[PDB]
Ligand binder design. Structure first.
Ligand code: PLP
Ligand code: PLP
Lengths: 379, 376
């Protein structure tokens, strides 16, 4: 632990200048990032085009953008474009899948599982088991492998990057371990897509638009491999469906903001254009730099090991400060945007709430130091 | 008569982008005004300036104003109103939440996907008595409901497939007498019929007569009913302290599109709801008149229906879907082809639907008439 300086990458700056100017300081891209000028205009145009030719004729004519969106998502998760369906977001995604799941509804997940995920699982009548993990919450693959062969489950659900902690989970090696026990794997990549290599052999993946891909709100994607999609049994319409259509078509049924979906196609486009590997290398670096700067703040400890290939850093208060009030103070008084993660976010891992830092590629050591600074004079 | 000069229609046309050709499809997706589009773009910009959720917090006055405009149109309270992805999301939220015996009466012309959601939620469905136009007979229904009660009545006050205006008010007071609550599907009716009729729950879609952004709906539930409801998610035996209506409104959504919608309802109250309805009723009359005389097509709706939905049944076996494509590709005229799946227990034969807003002229209706006769 001899501190290392920031790599200079023109990517940081290109990204800052393709997006509206921040009013204060935004360290919250793990909750809602920032839409590029291009993503904002593309959304606005679809809405204008709806007024000039009609909503549904506009939507039919947007099919090339929407399909490019599915193909971009597909290229990142190593699926096909036609395995990929649109969604309101990741919780819409997990519900559509678990609500559709045929036969014995039993699953194993991390104890650090997202609280609204556990909520969906139980609401769809799943039995949920914890997988073995280390002191950080990172799955033990050897043991998880032994556990799954002896005591199988109908599906393992893996959140490859938790909303509440910047540990990158060994997604790929867990997936072969599960396939080695004949068990499918669903990945919650709400935080992982556009941040971690999500090309790991998974049977289903879902993510949200508004996070690291910097898409509009109200959009997610759900990808299912065709072996698994055909076995699925959607809730709407009912199985006796006079209307005939595939599973993915049923799962994609419903009114949605189509402008936001073309918005989202542009934003995935921008991530491919920037280079997925370069953007991931830089986010790993943002995490490191973030943990270097915050290593010595009195009243706060850094939770993540320093070199986790992630941009998510979490601070547990060492004198029982309430992250929520520190967050409200940092906004009202310093224009700095963070997230306070309550216990409810991962009720089977978190003993104490945490303040979360999730900057995108455009953050500077200067700005991290300014956050460090503001965090010290908090009342 | 019909040469009414109405300034509302002209302001409404000029408040909005220029339609390429002719748009007679406001029952499927209307046209957002420059203000609604601007308000949506501005919320997305603000998210980028101050962060998504701090922007959503700042937007509360506009969001609540939206709930409160909706409340004034249906005679509910703002705090009874909850946002939704649209109307099918609404009905699913309400029926999946329904406690005790799941039994229900509705019209034989019920929305296909409404019946889909009813069946998916383990409801038994009985048909309500109706005349030849599929219009509920309220007295019959009263007797019917006394003799065989039902947990709730689901009235679609205006159908997607036909411009009949259902006697919502009188039906509500009859169901209420039999002690049975009434849910109204008002996706077509909100901004169109008077929807202040004492219903127990009402829902609607942003993109139709209110000309709001797509991806938004409203679901209003009276407090007496709301607190008896048992949402699917989170499960009823969980320890997060939220009200039922907070549970039904949980979830990733396009917040920009909701402030857009609040501007759209705003523009409807500003224009004067009564004046906008009297004018939609007029547009229906002119439509059914100008189209009374068209080889290959009979007008389905009595001329006097207070509605801008007129539907056309082909007399010589044309497929409305192809006529709609032809009309778009070859005349730039937008319409909707209603298939049987839209009302599977009322429709024997599919129909072509026009749903023009307040801004259509006798001229444009004659052009549509003309284009319809030279249709290969
Ligand atoms: C944000 C998030 C979700 C939920 O995404 P929505 O789009 O809000 O439904 C699920 N899992 C993780 C890890 C998240 O960060
Ligand atoms: C369009 C429509 C619906 C469903 O609206 P969505 O917003 O697409 O869910 C329901 N009822 C009627 C009468 C409709 O016209």
């Amino acid at each position: 632990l001899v501190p290392r300086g920031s790599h200079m990458m023109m990517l940081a700056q290109q990204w800052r200048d393709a997006r509206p100017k921040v009013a204060g300081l935004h360290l919250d891209s793990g909750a809602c990032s920032r839409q590029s000028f291009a993503v904002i205009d593309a959304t606005t145009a679809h809405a204008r085009h709806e007024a000039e030719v009609g909503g549904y004729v506009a939507a039919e004519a947007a099919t090339p953008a929407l399909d490019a969106g599915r193909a971009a998502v597909a290229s990142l998760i190593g699926f096909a474009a036609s395995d990929v369906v649109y969604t309101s977001g990741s919780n819409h995604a997990i519900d559509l899948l678990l609500s559709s799941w045929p036969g014995k509804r039993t699953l194993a997940c991390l104890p650090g599982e997202y609280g609204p995920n556990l909520s969906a699982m139980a609401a769809n009548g799943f039995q949920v088991r914890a997988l073995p993990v280390d002191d950080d919450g990172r799955v033990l693959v050897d043991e998880a492998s032994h556990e799954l062969s002896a005591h199988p489950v109908a599906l393992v659900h893996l959140t490859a990057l938790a909303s509440h902690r910047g540990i990158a989970q060994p997604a790929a090696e867990l997936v072969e371990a599960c396939h080695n026990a004949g068990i499918p794997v669903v990945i919650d990549a709400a935080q992982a897509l556009g941040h971690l290599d999500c090309n790991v052999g998974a049977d289903a993946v879902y993510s949200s638009s508004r996070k690291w891909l910097a898409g509009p709100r109200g959009v997610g994607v759900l990808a299912v491999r065709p072996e698994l999609a055909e076995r699925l049994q959607p809730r709407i319409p009912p199985s006796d469906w006079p209307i005939p259509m595939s599973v993915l078509e049923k799962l994609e049924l419903g009114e949605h903001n189509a402008a936001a979906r073309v918005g989202f196609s542009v934003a995935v486009g921008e991530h491919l254009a920037a280079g997925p590997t370069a953007v991931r290398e830089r986010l790993a670096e943002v995490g490191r730099l973030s943990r270097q700067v915050l290593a010595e703040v009195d009243g706060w400890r850094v939770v993540e090991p320093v070199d986790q290939p992630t941009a998510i850093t979490t601070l547990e208060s060492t004198d029982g400060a309430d992250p929520a009030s520190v967050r409200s103070w940092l906004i009202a008084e310093r224009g700095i945007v963070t997230t306070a993660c309550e216990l409810a976010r991962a009720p089977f891992e978190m003993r104490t709430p945490v303040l979360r830092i999730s900057p995108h590629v455009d953050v500077t050591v200067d700005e991290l130091e300014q956050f460090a600074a503001a965090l010290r004079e908090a009342p």
